Structure 1
Amino acid sequence: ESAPITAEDSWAVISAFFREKGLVSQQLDSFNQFVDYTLQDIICEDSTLILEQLAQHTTESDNISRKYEISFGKIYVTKPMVNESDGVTHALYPQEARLRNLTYSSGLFVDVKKRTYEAIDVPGRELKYELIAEESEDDSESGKVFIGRLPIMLRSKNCYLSEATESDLYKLKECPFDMGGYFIINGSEKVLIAQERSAGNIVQVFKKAAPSPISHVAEIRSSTLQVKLYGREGSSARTIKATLPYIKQDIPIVIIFRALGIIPDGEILEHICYDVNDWQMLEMLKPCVEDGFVIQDRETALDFIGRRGTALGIKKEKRIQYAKDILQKEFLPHITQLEGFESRKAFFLGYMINRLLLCALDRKDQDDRDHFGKKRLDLAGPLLAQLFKTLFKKLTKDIFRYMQRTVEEAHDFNMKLAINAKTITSGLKYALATGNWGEQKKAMSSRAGVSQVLNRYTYSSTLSHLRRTNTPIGRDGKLAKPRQLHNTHWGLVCPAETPEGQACGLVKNLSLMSCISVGTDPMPIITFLSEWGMEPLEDYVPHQSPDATRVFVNGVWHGVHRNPARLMETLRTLRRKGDINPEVSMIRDIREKELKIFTDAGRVYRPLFIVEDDESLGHKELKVRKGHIAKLMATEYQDEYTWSSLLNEGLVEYIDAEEEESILIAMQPEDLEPKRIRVSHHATTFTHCEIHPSMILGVAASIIPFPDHNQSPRNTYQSAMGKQAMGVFLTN
């Protein structure tokens, strides 16, 4: 029962995987995340609306200043239903929406509370408002203000189809072979194809050809910061300059450090360079010190900043305050926004310029822009959140404008009249139907093709359509590198199946087991990380400990550490034992002494096995055994013991395209022990195994027989032509 594993067990585990997740799980999970959590936060961002009407001083009775406060509360979502022209209300089902050209959607209810404050406007004195009237109907059903209608994706949590059995689907006349994952808009089925994006909060070092004085560039997007190094290699003149937002001329780096709060010159180099012995680092930083030593004053730099604003002739002190506020408000917002976090910003700027200068000293290379680990996929959820935020902002602006208008006439406003509930509904319906992802007024410049009409020609065509990703680069753009297949696509993208013509390589189809992460909070991770022996970045001195690992969380440096091996072992223990959900990625780079933790959304991951060293057998072996496979067979035939049972026991692990840079995988299980030509790989420190190589293929190419005896373009051609065969697209 302690025996090794054979490929039959691999197919057993895959059978369990598809019996648990499904082929369209990504859309459903993104929609559930959006509806349950993000929708509440989008309104809670802008709950309070304030009107401050000062006294017109026309008469004594007009000397009272007024304040109006509007606040929002919970969100309630009903099951989809329709009200006919007669005013009768009945629950709407997909058949009626399809036949009658309706729109599958539901209604949204939000709590609203109002407050009125009145103060006596005494000139020369601060206004002291007092609570007088507060309208809050939380104790009655009239408090739920109807705000709009939201489309519903099939088979999601709200839809009636979620809990339907086979006889339920037949009496309602469903195809049991239908999976959901699409909207019904205007009586036609629509689907949202995943949209590819380049990640943010990651410093990237580039390079330039030299007809121009530019030599290197360091980029970060949080708001953008460019710290450029000018001066050719080997010359005496070295310049390092940063380009801040709303500052045009630009100013050097030592001036930035002086303005930021680090006055002494010796501390600058402790911020930049983390190795005392290296002399080339300081040699390249010498001209910066020489030029920045002339001015020991923040205020000259702040005067530099003040002149370049649109307003001209401002007094010096106001310019000082403005330039002071620019740093904490718009300079690297992804670290912090509130006041007093200057040490973190100074160290992060030092780290960025350190990495730029390291690349400038040929110790490393340019960042690869094609690496699939630096790309995120936007599903229905994020796109809906974007559009909902925009429309809600416009709607609340309109409410404020109308309420001001009715205050001008001294008329009480009806909250059920100030709201134009048609704005949200019309905007969402127009965006989903036309596909132009933007406002109706500015739809010309918005993204297109985001929403497409589902293809039902054959069943495999529906399957292939619900699993498609688009790379929003100009399809006539002559950039060859995004088109070509890249080393990081192993197991996450189908190599065979791609369109032909102008969309070659730009349209991608996932493999059978490449899921996507939903999103999770980073705060508990940071709290635990500081709990288990992490020194904060405030109390970090380079010279006391020059061999300290740096610690990152989603691209913001929080400090250092001294013994990282046990931290990684404990972190992976907790990730494997369910204390943290396995969608979080945790990489360690030994060569540069770095730790990176990612908890964001949009990362493609695939399952893999786990290799551990068994001393009783004297060598390594998988954690999985014949007992687990027997339990899987028992549960499958009984259709308990499921895929999550394997996951929580530390038998499988989800690996993205970034952690893969620091692992070793044995492809066949028998390759882990000490026709065709199969070579015995020299490795002996294996960490994971491939569940099965066949899964590196999509859904289209999983029907060719013996695909490896074929030239690859032939596999591509059949993956194309498999969507034009005639057959039973649905059993109903």
Structure 2
Amino acid sequence: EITPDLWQEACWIVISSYFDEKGLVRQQLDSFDEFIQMSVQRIVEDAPPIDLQPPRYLLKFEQIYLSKPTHWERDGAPSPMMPNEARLRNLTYSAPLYVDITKTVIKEGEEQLQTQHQKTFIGKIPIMLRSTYCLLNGLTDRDLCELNECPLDPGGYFIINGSEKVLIAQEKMATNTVYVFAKKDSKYAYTGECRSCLENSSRPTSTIWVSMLARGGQGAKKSAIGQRIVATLPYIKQEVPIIIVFRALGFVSDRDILEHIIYDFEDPEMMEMVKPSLDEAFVIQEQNVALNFIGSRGAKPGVTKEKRIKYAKEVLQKEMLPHVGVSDFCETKKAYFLGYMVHRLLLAALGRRELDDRDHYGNKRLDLAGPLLAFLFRGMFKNLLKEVRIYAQKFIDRGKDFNLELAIKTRIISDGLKYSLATGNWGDQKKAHQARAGVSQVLNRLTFASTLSHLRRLNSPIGLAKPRQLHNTLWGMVCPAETPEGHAVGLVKNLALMAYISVGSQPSPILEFLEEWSMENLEEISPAAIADATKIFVNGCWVGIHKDPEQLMNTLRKLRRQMDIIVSEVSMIRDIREREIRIYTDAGRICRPLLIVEKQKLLLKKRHIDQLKEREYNNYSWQDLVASGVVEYIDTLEEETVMLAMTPDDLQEKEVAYCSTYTHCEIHPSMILGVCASIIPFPDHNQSPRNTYQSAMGKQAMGVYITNFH
């Protein structure tokens, strides 16, 4: 039925199940697993075919193949590497990377004899222990002990040259999310940041800025002109107004431009606020002239006006908000998204909304080992393709033949990955100036607590006190007491114990379901109906509007709670004050479990507690607990619009009326503490500075750091 005054046992049993199923380092393990399983295949597949010529030569890559880690001894005999041997001999723990090259030849004589170079070696990918592609996976206690590897070791680290290196998650501004900021001193009054990128596969982040000119030069007609709106497009040296850009997208009718910018035509205040841009753009009236204008101010001005037109079209096509679409005919989506962008800017201008806080961890994500290795592999693969292209051109200008076996240089990927993972200069070796440092620190091994704390660690890119202060967002999300005492205090933080980082998934099934579920796509839509309906976002990109918000919310939540086609890791938002439904699926989000609450009672009933208490020989665990729709993954974004209960028996039971619509209930309040801060007894009774100091020491508290020390 229910769990009255038995809550201690129930909560600690469910936490037992959670830690027995997942563990402590699953963020690293799952990130790397997803990287190896999908990111490498996506990166290699989504690469430009190599075309060169006379006969035409085309090369296309194919499925990735991986094998267990091996050592290429001097005699050349393959030998399964072992983590112990890797540590002792200063041998990098890695496995070869194999691909299939399809060499298709065209001699302009129907001589297409395609040859498939199956299993072509291209480099060595470092492999991190206890991963599904490591050699320790699945071994029980007996084999691990027999193999001279500690059973208690959480793994989650690489081995380069015998030094155990561990990747540290890095914070960055969340991609594909329009922000608004108010620079205090800058010539722009308010500005809008929408750092955006495609689905973590094609090109790094490209930023679009939109801003408002501050009131200046008064006394003259400048005040009569008023505040003008300006945006600095990517790959454009200087700034440019907005309506000119909108006309560059191909929409000339000022009625249509205001329809895009404005959803309700009964707001004279905002009409007057946007009028200055209309007056400014009264000299540009056609698409071609606007394209010439924007292209004329690029880094390399075109030789002829057709050259400026082509450059402007290219930059507005590929480098302009890639996440919304780069499929040529997607100009309407770009136009609508820019309209929403400037609409949010105007709403910030009029004070109807409020400026988004930069240091709000619901507005930034964590680059885990997966995405970081994906970025490095992207760079190294581009370098390898360039090397192959130049080698092929040089060797075929003679015109004799071509050989892929010798053309491909496995040296480049292996050394690039090894170097970047070893010394921490994250990027190409020659470009250390622009390469972010501090990544892949040496694993700390003074104590088991130290090792776990180092595995579960974040880091900010900052070298002012605002970024380095604790924030409300970090409740149960990052350890509050823990932080380094030194100069890096605040920037470096450890995850909460129950915290779980989003490995990531694709948005295809969500878009399919939404499109089927009586949602109007954002092309065959009447513009006038936008205001009265609710917007929809999937990883930022606007995809349509819906007129039944709560029904859609209930359906999506029901699907998530059952692991239907929508993945459990996904979260969905509803800001009713703004009429939006934000759905996020990209990796890098951070999340924690919570208990669902319906009506006023927990869905966690005595039967679930009994089953979990009998977890052994019952094939019932945390995943099966989530199967019954009892515990729900609520990330920081979704925490923004829910209500939590500290303890059911204290809050859920009726009392003097304070709240009666608790949507979720905490697993246990103590879970907010981190690894090193958890061992503190009675941390509440202590003063927080001394909790912090002790949390620093727990790394330095010596002991039996690992069982197999000898």
Q: TM-score, normalised by structure 1?
A: 0.90
Q: How does 1:132-531 map to 2 (within 5 A)?
A: 132-137=112-117, 143-209=118-184, 213-222=187-196, 223-232=206-215, 235-236=223-224, 237-309=226-298, 314-474=303-463, 479-531=464-516
Q: Is the 8 A contact 2:252 2:286 kept in 1?
A: no
User: How far is 1:293 from its partner?
Assistant: 3.6
Query: Secondary structure at 2:458's aligned position in 1?
Result: strand
Q: Is the 8 A contact 2:644 2:663 kept in 1?
A: yes
Query: Secondary structure at 1:539's aligned position in 2?
Result: coil
Amino acid at match of 2:495: L
Amino acid at match of 1:593: R
Amino acid at match of 2:39: T
Amino acid at match of 1:657: T
User: How far is 1:14 from its partner?
Assistant: 0.5
Deviates more, 1:313-322 or 1:31-40: 313-322
Deviates more, 1:15-24 or 1:449-458: 449-458
Question: What CA distance in whole angstroms lies between the structure 1 residues aligned with 2:243 and 2:495?
Answer: 48
User: How far is 1:243 from its partner?
Assistant: 2.3
Deviations 1:573-605 (A, max 9, x none): 111111122111101111111110000001110
Deviations 1:449-486 (A, max 9, x none): 21122222121111111111111110xxxx20121110
The answer to whether the aligner puts 1:548 opposite 2:526 as a matched pair is no
Question: What CA distance in whole angstroms lies between the structure 2 residues aligned with 1:47 and 1:542?
Answer: 38
Amino acid at match of 2:150: C
1:519–1:14 distance in 2 versus 1, CA, 3 Å? same
For structure 2, list consecutive stretches of 5 or more residues without a partner in the other structure.
Answer: 197-205
User: How far is 1:135 from its partner?
Assistant: 2.1
1:155–1:257 distance in 2 versus 1, CA, 3 Å? closer
User: How far is 1:312 from its partner?
Assistant: 5.5
Amino acid at match of 2:601: E
User: How far is 1:321 from its partner?
Assistant: 3.7
The answer to whether the aligner puts 1:658 opposite 2:643 as a matched pair is no
1:530–1:456 distance in 2 versus 1, CA, 3 Å? same
Name the Cα RMSD after superposition: 2.1
Structure with the bigger percentage of strand: 1
Deviates more, 1:648-657 or 1:716-725: 716-725
Query: Secondary structure at 2:114's aligned position in 1?
Result: strand
Query: Secondary structure at 2:65's aligned position in 1?
Result: strand
Q: Is the 8 A contact 2:71 2:78 kept in 1?
A: yes
Question: What CA distance in whole angstroms lies between the structure 1 residues aligned with 2:339 and 2:133?
Answer: 50
Question: What CA distance in whole angstroms lies between the structure 2 residues aligned with 1:307 and 1:662?
Answer: 46
Q: Is the 8 A contact 1:437 1:450 kept in 2?
A: yes
Q: Is the 8 A contact 2:251 2:287 kept in 1?
A: no
Question: What CA distance in whole angstroms lies between the structure 2 residues aligned with 1:445 and 1:625?
Answer: 55
Q: How does 1:641-656 map to 2 (within 5 A)?
A: 641-656=620-635
For structure 1, list consecutive stretches of 5 or more residues without a partner in the other structure.
Answer: 53-64, 120-128, 138-142, 614-619
User: How far is 1:294 from its partner?
Assistant: 4.2
User: How far is 1:491 from its partner?
Assistant: 0.1
Amino acid at match of 2:644: I
Question: What CA distance in whole angstroms lies between the structure 1 residues aligned with 2:48 and 2:335?
Answer: 34
Q: Is the 8 A contact 2:348 2:354 kept in 1?
A: yes
1:714–1:249 distance in 2 versus 1, CA, 3 Å? closer
Amino acid at match of 2:184: A
Amino acid at match of 1:661: E
Query: Secondary structure at 1:270's aligned position in 2?
Result: helix
Deviates more, 1:242-251 or 1:352-361: 242-251
Q: Is the 8 A contact 1:494 1:696 kept in 2?
A: yes
Larger of the two Rg values belongs to structure: 1
User: How far is 1:115 from its partner?
Assistant: 2.0
Query: Secondary structure at 2:573's aligned position in 1?
Result: strand
1:180–1:303 distance in 2 versus 1, CA, 3 Å? closer
Question: What CA distance in whole angstroms lies between the structure 1 residues aligned with 2:42 and 2:262?
Answer: 41
Give the corresponding residue for 2:648.
Answer: 669
Amino acid at match of 2:663: T
Query: Secondary structure at 1:348's aligned position in 2?
Result: helix
Give the corresponding residue for 1:123.
Answer: none
Q: Is the 8 A contact 1:204 1:218 kept in 2?
A: yes
Question: What CA distance in whole angstroms lies between the structure 2 residues aligned with 1:730 and 1:224?
Answer: 46
Give the corresponding residue for 1:70.
Answer: 59
Q: Which runs of 4+ in 1 moved over 6 A?
A: none
Amino acid at match of 2:615: T
Amino acid at match of 1:97: A
User: How far is 1:264 from its partner?
Assistant: 2.5
Deviations 1:115-166 (A, max 9, x none): 22123xxxxxxxxx644332225xxxxx321111111111111222112122
Q: Is the 8 A contact 1:115 1:131 kept in 2?
A: no
Within the candidate set 693, 696, 705, 1:729 is matched to 705
The answer to whether the aligner puts 1:623 opposite 2:603 as a matched pair is yes
Deviates more, 1:486-495 or 1:156-165: 156-165
1:485–1:2 distance in 2 versus 1, CA, 3 Å? closer
User: How far is 1:177 from its partner?
Assistant: 1.4
Question: What CA distance in whole angstroms lies between the structure 2 residues aligned with 1:94 and 1:87?
Answer: 20
Q: Is the 8 A contact 1:515 1:606 kept in 2?
A: yes
Deviations 1:512-552 (A, max 9, x none): 10010111111211111011111122233343563111111
